[PDB]
Amino acid sequence: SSDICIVGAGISGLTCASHLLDSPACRGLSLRIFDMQQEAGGRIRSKMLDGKASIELGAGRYSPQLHPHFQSAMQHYSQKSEVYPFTQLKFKSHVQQKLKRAMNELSPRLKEHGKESFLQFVSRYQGHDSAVGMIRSMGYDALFLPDISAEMAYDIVGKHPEIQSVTDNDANQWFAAETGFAGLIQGIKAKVKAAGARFSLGYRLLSVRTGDGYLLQLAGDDGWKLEHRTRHLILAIPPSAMAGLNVDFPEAWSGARYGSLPLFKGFLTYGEPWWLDYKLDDQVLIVDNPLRKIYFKGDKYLFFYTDSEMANYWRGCVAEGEDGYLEQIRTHLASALGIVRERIPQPLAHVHKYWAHGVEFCRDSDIDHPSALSHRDSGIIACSDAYTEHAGWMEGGLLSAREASRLLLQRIA
Amino acid sequence: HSSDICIVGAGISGLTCASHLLDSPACRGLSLRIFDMQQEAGGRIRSKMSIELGAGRYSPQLHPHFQSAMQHYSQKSEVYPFTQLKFKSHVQQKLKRAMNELSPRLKEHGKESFLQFVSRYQGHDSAVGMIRSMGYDALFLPDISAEMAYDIVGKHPEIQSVTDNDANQWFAAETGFAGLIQGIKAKVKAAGARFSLGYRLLSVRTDGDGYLLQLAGDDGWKLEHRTRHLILAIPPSAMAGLNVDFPEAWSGARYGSLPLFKGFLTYGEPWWLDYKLDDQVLIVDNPLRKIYFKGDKYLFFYTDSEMANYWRGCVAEGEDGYLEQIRTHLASALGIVRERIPQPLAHVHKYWAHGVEFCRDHPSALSHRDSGIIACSDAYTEHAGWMEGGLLSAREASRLLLQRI
Ligand SMILES: Cc1cc2nc3c(=O)[nH]c(=O)nc-3n(C[C@H](O)[C@H](O)[C@H](O)COP(=O)(O)OP(=O)(O)OC[C@H]3O[C@@H](n4cnc5c(N)ncnc54)[C@H](O)[C@@H]3O)c2cc1C
Numbered sequence A: 001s002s003d004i005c006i007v008g009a010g011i012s013g014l015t016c017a018s019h020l021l022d023s024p025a026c027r028g029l030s031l032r033i034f035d036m037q038q039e040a041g042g043r044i045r046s047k048m049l050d051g052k053a054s055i056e057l058g059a060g061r062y063s064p065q066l067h068p069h070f071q072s073a074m075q076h077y078s079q080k081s082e083v084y085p086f087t088q089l090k091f092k093s094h095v096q097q098k099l100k101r102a103m104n105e106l107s108p109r110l111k112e113h114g115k116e117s118f119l120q121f122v123s124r125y126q127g128h129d130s131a132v133g134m135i136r137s138m139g140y141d142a143l144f145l146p147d148i149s150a151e152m153a154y155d156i157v158g159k160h161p162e163i164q165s166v167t168d169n170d171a172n173q174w175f176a177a178e179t180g181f182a183g184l185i186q187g188i189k190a191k192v193k194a195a196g197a198r199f200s201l202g203y204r205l206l207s208v209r210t211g212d213g214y215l216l217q218l219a220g221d222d223g224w225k226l227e228h229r230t231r232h233l234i235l236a237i238p239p240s241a242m243a244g245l246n247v248d249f250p251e252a253w254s255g256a257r258y259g260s261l262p263l264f265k266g267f268l269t270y271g272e273p274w275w276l277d278y279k280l281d282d283q284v285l286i287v288d289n290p291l292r293k294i295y296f297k298g299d300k301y302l303f304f305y306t307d308s309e310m311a312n313y314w315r316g317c318v319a320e321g322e323d324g325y326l327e328q329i330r331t332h333l334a335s336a337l338g339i340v341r342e343r344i345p346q347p348l349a350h351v352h353k354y355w356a357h358g359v360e361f362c363r364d365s366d367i368d369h370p371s372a373l374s375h376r377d378s379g380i381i382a383c384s385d386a387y388t389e390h391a392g393w394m395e396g397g398l399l400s401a402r403e404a405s406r407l408l409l410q411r412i413a
Numbered sequence B: 001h002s003s004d005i006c007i008v009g010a011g012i013s014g015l016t017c018a019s020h021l022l023d024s025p026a027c028r029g030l031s032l033r034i035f036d037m038q039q040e041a042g043g044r045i046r047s048k049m050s051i052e053l054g055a056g057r058y059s060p061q062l063h064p065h066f067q068s069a070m071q072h073y074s075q076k077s078e079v080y081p082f083t084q085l086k087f088k089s090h091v092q093q094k095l096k097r098a099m100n101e102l103s104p105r106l107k108e109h110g111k112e113s114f115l116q117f118v119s120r121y122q123g124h125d126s127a128v129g130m131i132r133s134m135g136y137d138a139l140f141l142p143d144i145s146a147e148m149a150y151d152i153v154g155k156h157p158e159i160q161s162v163t164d165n166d167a168n169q170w171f172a173a174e175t176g177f178a179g180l181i182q183g184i185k186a187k188v189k190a191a192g193a194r195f196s197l198g199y200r201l202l203s204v205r206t207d208g209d210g211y212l213l214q215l216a217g218d219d220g221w222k223l224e225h226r227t228r229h230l231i232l233a234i235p236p237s238a239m240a241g242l243n244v245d246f247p248e249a250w251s252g253a254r255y256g257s258l259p260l261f262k263g264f265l266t267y268g269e270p271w272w273l274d275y276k277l278d279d280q281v282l283i284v285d286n287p288l289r290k291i292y293f294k295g296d297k298y299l300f301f302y303t304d305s306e307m308a309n310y311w312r313g314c315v316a317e318g319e320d321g322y323l324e325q326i327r328t329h330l331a332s333a334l335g336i337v338r339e340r341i342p343q344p345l346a347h348v349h350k351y352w353a354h355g356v357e358f359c360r361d362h363p364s365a366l367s368h369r370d371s372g373i374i375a376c377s378d379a380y381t382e383h384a385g386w387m388e389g390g391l392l393s394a395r396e397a398s399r400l401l402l403q404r405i
């Protein structure tokens, strides 16, 4: 039993625990934190690649100009930052060199047609084939989706490091975590455990019922069933996960609608840093082939990152088998570089991760969305980056946690 | 995503089926796919560096097929010492005699539960005290008949002496039974088996000739796989989750299961040497139930059925309480003060919600009347609860599938 239960130990849930435990109104309230995974962190998943480097299977970068709360958290918990180098395109295609003017040329038309999908918007002025080639040249297949408006696309482009110069946001600086953002998740976790929160990792919330308070049915990843009673409940899970529980989401919560799209990253190490030769170190290529964005980190490893249908494409390759997945990568590396396949070596060790719901966000609405939500009848609070204007970014988790904890403090009344 | 032959389950049964099939001239060049919901093969064999969180011992006398696998794959063995009770309670001293006296009555009343059967002749309280001192709470289950209980006692090393089977010898794997799983795996792979670990079978349908399997990856990825021949090398509990009308359309026997739990602890010093406990096992009434001290390396305990659940509930309530309970029950087992039991340096545990599965009582593998699907598990065998049973089921499941080809 607890007074306060948080389900979700991503950055959102852990940060809620932190604000709550920082407050005098929470003195003497026991706090329980569940997560279905065996480690805290959610979409922040740092990993050692074959003992050679720390890589980010999930969130990988931030900007102090866009993400001031996150920057403040990194400093607070004493995490070392290094420069994220992938902030420009050193090897632009001809289409990519036209991007800035092309985009600038269309911007005033956002007034009249900015609510339609970016693909239709661009197509309205350039026709289909040219719109396709231009949009594809920015490397985020999200920009092809029907539920990404032209206004949303301009926003997206200005906030991603590889293409921020297209909308003239080159001033924004970007950083990564020298030892992984998991170190921040560990630092928050250590702080909340030190203040008395109790962690139950490995349990998946299946359903919730109200009488004075709440009764939760959870299942352990080894089969162990658990029931837990709390007086106050924050579900620090994304919209997709909310939809799996029996709490009538979103009708009973906001009635807003939430989009979702998958993500994929693959990291590969090589015997020789063969890309040094071509001056690719610390650079990113954005290409039309299914690798889409190819990043070469120093002389240590390379990786690629894709979304939406290309993420599903890569996951399907993996399902067929390692060998064909690796060979497909080699074929697309050779095409991207314009050199012959046998000149791309075979990798030494690699890792990959597919996120079925890597990004979740509020769909374009005329209703303002609050940063955290509560259930009409039950007073259950819902916390996620998806509910903020930084949907898709750790910053939106911090923003949502601030509001969720504020709301819980006010319910505690 | 298709195969000629698909095996779901990469425990020792599934891997051994793949082994048999890939050895047969009839499967030369056929495409063979093996799925498992976990990210590593092995199932209920799980080694950690070296302790056994799952299966931990075998006997050459009881498990000749197992001994032959260990031999064929050059896996080394070490004496498993926990083969007699050095510190018998008064009740434990009486067990061999009392079990000898009851045994003639199995022919009359041996189909009753072991508890009923012993109560019948000794009374409830006496039966409880006796049955308890054998250390397997499976022996209290209405599902476990007197005749099955005697089979159980004769097969388990810590109490085999009780039915005149001290002669049976026991060994563990010197590098863990996972090295055996890794050997079978590397061999089926070299022969061209393809693995898809991390996928859970949800359902199957018989699309024309063949079968269409629906699977979910552990990251959510949904996958459909077509095959021409199918072995489900999963236990009955898992078969029941599928859409294949198990057990009715197969055997029509009924199947039992019970949970298991093991906890392992290490210490700055092997403190138990003071009590001459190295390489000895104690069976106690308290919740630890069977407590083993392994040379001067570590100790562990091993429980089943409702004491397995007790320990899983403890773990769920938190580490401190769990570690404290263990410390409390170790002192009572030894009859010494709590403070004489140091705090561990490290520990690990594992709960198996379906640790043992068995037929309530049968061929060694099954097949579905209508669909031709084959089912393979130690549960369908005379060695349910043992890796040997898995090897026997795989022989038969392989034989059935070769027939089908
Ligand atoms: C590939 C990828 C790259 C990214 N890159 C960046 C980047 O460069 N910069 C950046 O700022 N952001 C990035 N992000 C986004 C960032 O990861 C998210 O914005 C943030 O991590 C979300 O935190 P959260 O705590 O709201 O949700 P999550 O991190 O999703 O955590 C929710 C938690 O709830 C748990 N859960 C869900 N349902 C249940 C249930 N029923 N019971 C129990 N537990 C449950 C999950 O296990 C999870 O731990 C990236 C994301 C991905 C996927």
Ligand SMILES: Cc1cc2nc3c(=O)[nH]c(=O)nc-3n(C[C@H](O)[C@H](O)[C@H](O)COP(=O)(O)OP(=O)(O)OC[C@H]3O[C@@H](n4cnc5c(N)ncnc54)[C@H](O)[C@@H]3O)c2cc1C
Pocket (backbone or CB within 6 Å): B008, B009, B010, B011, B012, B013, B014, B035, B036, B037, B038, B041, B042, B043, B044, B045, B053, B054, B055, B056, B057, B058, B199, B200, B201, B202, B233, B234, B235, B238, B260, B261, B262, B352, B354, B355, B356, B376, B377, B378, B384, B385, B386, B387, B388, B389, B390
């Ligand atoms: C605690 C413990 C101690 C033991 N000690 C001993 C011992 O000392 N000696 C001994 O001989 N035996 C022992 N055993 C028994 C031995 O572990 C088993 O008899 C044997 O390993 C069973 O092998 P199997 O391949 O038939 O089934 P499992 O090992 O249970 O393999 C079944 C596999 O199927 C997979 N699976 C299930 N459902 C699905 C699905 N829907 N989709 C995909 N995959 C699926 C599982 O992930 C698993 O890998 C012990 C067992 C336990 C639990």
